[PDB]
Amino acid sequence: TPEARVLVVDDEANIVELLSVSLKFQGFEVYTATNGAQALDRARETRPDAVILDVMMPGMDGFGVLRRLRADGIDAPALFLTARDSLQDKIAGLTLGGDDYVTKPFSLEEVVARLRVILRRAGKRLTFADIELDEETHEVWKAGQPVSLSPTEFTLLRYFVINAGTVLSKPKILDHVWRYDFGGDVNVVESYVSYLRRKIDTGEKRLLHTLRGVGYVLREP
Template sequence: MKLLLIEDNDAMRTTLQRSFERWGAQVVACADGARALDRWRASLPDVVLLDLSLPGMDGLEVLAQARAEGLLAPVLILTARGTVGDRVLGLNAGADDYLPKPFDLDELEARVRALARRAGAERSPGLPDDDFGPACGGLRCDRRSGAVHWHDTVFELPSRELALLRALLARPGQAASKEALFAQVFDGEPDVQPEAIEVVAYRLRKRLAPTGVQLVTLRGLGYLLKATP
């Protein structure tokens, strides 16, 4: 899935870009409203995350111009302007969803997934097998979007659990070290201790319970995925 991120706050833009890239999205980032339309036209994104308070051109102006040009990608507005009037203005200008700051990252990712599904960016069941990586039980990862499917449905997970599951699905039945998995899940995030991977593994193990796939801990080796008979 291609995601256009239009956000002028450097720290937030970097955090969001890293998070969605771990999920498997291709992210084009832009910090300037005046350049946003050029990026939109060039990248043809599946979903747009749009801040309203932008230098060069206000986010609502960007959105109105995009819609006037026939750029129809779903838009989720992210902004500190949280009044009902601001939400109405954004939706009337052509936005598909609205999330005021501060927001929960897991909720944001769930909303982006929902917009992508509605727009067809996250593809439906019946994809060709070569679009998927190795399977474990009913779980397999779509190489194109980075989404994990359980049988015929997208398996919804928070970003870190999803990153861990994708890493383990690349080699089902084979152990991956905690160090290697930590690097893939946290991707250089500052001030995160190596033991944090154990918390993510614990949460993922609980979420996998209905699937019949087990996350197995191997002392001294790391973790692996195992399908139960």
């Protein structure tokens, strides 16, 4: 998944190019528009998580374009590119809700950082037996105690928890854990289940079982 879908609205083509190349290189899915009409069309087609728009635009300024978008039910937060001479006059429009701005001449570092903050502001614990996971941060706990897991062990633990009680064959685990990218020996699944038992299945009762010839299952006996 991309980190977010961003729509860039600016009538200056070289700034559209710069912003989208940067954002794409940072892992964002970027869509573009050179005016208000193109902006409303792209926002309906691509449903963005954030909008970057230049306040200075031909015909209709960046506030007007944003009003129209918001009237169509597009509620994504916005980042304005704005001139410094107009700051005390425009401050109310520039920072309402969860919107923010950068002033010209701007840096890409700043654009990216202010974008991540508005995305975080706009966003509004799996348990099994004595195991707990946070899907957001990837922290794992075992009887209250922090456990350090690699990205693959985490994915593997989550897959077992979400499917607690289901017998999961090596091929099903292999497809899921490496997202169909990997098609080599299933005994990699055997290694990972082994690492994962060594880190989280260390209590009185065995939680992670092998049904020999068939698969693995997580069940509190």
